[PDB]
Amino acid sequence: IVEGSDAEIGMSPWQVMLFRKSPQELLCGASLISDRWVLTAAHCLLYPPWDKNFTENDLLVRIGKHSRTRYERNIEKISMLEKIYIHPRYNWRENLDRDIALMKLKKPVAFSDYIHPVCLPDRETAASLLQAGYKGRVTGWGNLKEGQPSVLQVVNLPIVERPVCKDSTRIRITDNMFCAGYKPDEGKRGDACEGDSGGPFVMKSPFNNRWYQMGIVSWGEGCDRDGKYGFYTHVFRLKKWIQKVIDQFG
């Protein structure tokens, strides 16, 4: 995260760290949506252009963390994966369209003060909250500039008008994406960066006071560049796929 600040303890209890066993390294962010399921960006697992193609046994899921590098004994929980599910129509060849994947853990995680799932949006919540100008929150242990942070970083960003998103890049944008960030004249700044991918873009409903994950950190051109914006996977647009996978595979 660029231009963000340290998260408070227990601020994002659904934040998950995708950790590579060997070498031991942070791969991406992710989110806990139930005691057995984790949501992340498909490019974190499969991206042929960089010969990236991880399988269940190559990774570890670390939940309940705050510090990036320390093994938070008695606080975090490390889980193994049972099965990875990548959207059948994930478009890695062109624009990362449908950049989403689900990961089923071997055994349920027990919730605690630091581990708790985020809600997935219903059509109504998505309708009322996903509006240009409304701010969401992004979290992660990724780069601070285009040094990695000591602890989880957080930044609040405004959703941007589709036209503006379209006009800032050469990449073909689809209905399965939305972009966020401050305009160059807006003064404030901030953005996700390397290491943040797969993480959650969440919003707090003013109706029932719950946090909902509206997006997944997907891609950008640089980090916190003026005139550029971060792009996120539109979670609601892909909810039927999510429902399908979960009720079909447990």
Binding site: F19, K21, Q24, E25, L26, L60, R68, T69, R70, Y71, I78, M80
Partner: peptide
């Protein structure tokens, strides 16, 4: 710079 995690998980 990551701290060694328990081998119990590495298995």
């Amino acid at each position: 710079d990551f701290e060694e995690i328990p081998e119990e998980y590495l298995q």
